[PDB]
Amino acid sequence: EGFIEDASVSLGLRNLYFNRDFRQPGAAQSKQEEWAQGFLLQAKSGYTQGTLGLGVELIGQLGLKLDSSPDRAGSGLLPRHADGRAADDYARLGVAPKLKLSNTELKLGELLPELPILLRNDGRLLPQTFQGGMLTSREIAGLTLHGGQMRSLSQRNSSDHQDLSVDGRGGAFSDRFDYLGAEYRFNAERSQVGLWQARLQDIYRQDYYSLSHKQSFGGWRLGASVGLFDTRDEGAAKLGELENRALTGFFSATRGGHSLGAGYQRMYGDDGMLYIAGTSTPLVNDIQVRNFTSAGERSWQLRYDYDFVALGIPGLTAMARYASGAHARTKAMDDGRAWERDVDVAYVIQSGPLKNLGLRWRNAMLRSNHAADVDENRLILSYSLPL
Numbered sequence: 001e002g003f004i005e006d007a008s009v010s011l012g013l014r015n016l017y018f019n020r021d022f023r024q025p026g027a028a029q030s031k032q033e034e035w036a037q038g039f040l041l042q043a044k045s046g047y048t049q050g051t052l053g054l055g056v057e058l059i060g061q062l063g064l065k066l067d068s069s070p071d072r073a074g075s076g077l078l079p080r081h082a083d084g085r086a087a088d089d090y091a092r093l094g095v096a097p098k099l100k101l102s103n104t105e106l107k108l109g110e111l112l113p114e115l116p117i118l119l120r121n122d123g124r125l126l127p128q129t130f131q132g133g134m135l136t137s138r139e140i141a142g143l144t145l146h147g148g149q150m151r152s153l154s155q156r157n158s159s160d161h162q163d164l165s166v167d168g169r170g171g172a173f174s175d176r177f178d179y180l181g182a183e184y185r186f187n188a189e190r191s192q193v194g195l196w197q198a199r200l201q202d203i204y205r206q207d208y209y210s211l212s213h214k215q216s217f218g219g220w221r222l223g224a225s226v227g228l229f230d231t232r233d234e235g236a237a238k239l240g241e242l243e244n245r246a247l248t249g250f251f252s253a254t255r256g257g258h259s260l261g262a263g264y265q266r267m268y269g270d271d272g273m274l275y276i277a278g279t280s281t282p283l284v285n286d287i288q289v290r291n292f293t294s295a296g297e298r299s300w301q302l303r304y305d306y307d308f309v310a311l312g313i314p315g316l317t318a319m320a321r322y323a324s325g326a327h328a329r330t331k332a333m334d335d336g337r338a339w340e341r342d343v344d345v346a347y348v349i350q351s352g353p354l355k356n357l358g359l360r361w362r363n364a365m366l367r368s369n370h371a372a373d374v375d376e377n378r379l380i381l382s383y384s385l386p387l
């Protein structure tokens, strides 16, 4: 009578071939080329009856080495020993109790947060996870309030957890990551304004402002979004004084399966974008291999999408984008330039025994006069088994 009625168990399967090719010689390491199979166990109970409902969730991970050689092993699909050898496997299991009162919900334990201020990475074999507690509340129509504290994370290619730190810096760690968020949706569900504040204890404080609108016009579906991060050092300020403002925004137009979109992004201040180690960001140029977040980096993006439904081939989609950056500072030089060209093709079998089986290919070129030039390919096989 509930609890057992809204319960679900799924087994996510991801077969991944990853090949990042470094073009410049001597690159010391010529290549990251690995192949792995991941398993993602997610089991949720429903909630016990009563005004205060209890429930529990479980996240299980298993990554298996299918092919690797130490000369080419840092791909991020697998943990990597000091000898340079990939692990043959790694696993992880976290439980997550949950309470629900009215329209307010609390989860503690192993978490998969997808927050503008803390976006869990899923760019390899197995998801990044966090450890702590999340509150989510929507007692008011249109409004969603967020609060929580994280204490540790587990990176995508690790069984283990570790204290939090900031991407690209390390050295300074924290026990305590506290946030608060508010999100108001209006104009017949079209417009939305967001407000966020996060505090990585004794390292940084980060504000985030968000503005977005989405509206259909006959056959056109236009979308506009703009966000702003403002990050300063905080407390004892272990990384020292920090100073980044980071702007992002795009506009998107879609009609008859075709999508075109332009994006802009700019890093202001002595520091580039500051975020939690290994985490993703909602910045528009956070793309396949690079995210264009170096100090002072100004960048834009043009993106094209097509949904092959219209041709009579549903499940087939294609995407291409070009990202260009300038004025990046890298001790060696200011006016650092880079450009990345991504190509995404995906197919999902829509009928038959193999319904929902998915194959996706991601290809990227990156060239720069500061970053390492790369060519990257990933083959991704996907399927989700309900239990």
Ligand SMILES: CCCCCCCCCCO[C@@H]1O[C@H](CO)[C@@H](O[C@H]2O[C@@H](CO)[C@@H](O)[C@H](O)[C@@H]2O)[C@H](O)[C@H]1O
Binding pocket: 039, 040, 041, 060, 061, 062, 091, 092, 093, 094, 159, 160, 161, 162
């Ligand atoms: C379909 C997929 C189902 C897979 C389920 C299989 C069960 C998983 C068995 C191993 O699980 C892991 O064991 C690691 C070794 O013990 C732990 O390291 C963790 O354990 C800590 C101590 O608890 C520390 O040693 C580390 O830093 C790290 O956090 C970790 O938390 C745990 O998840």
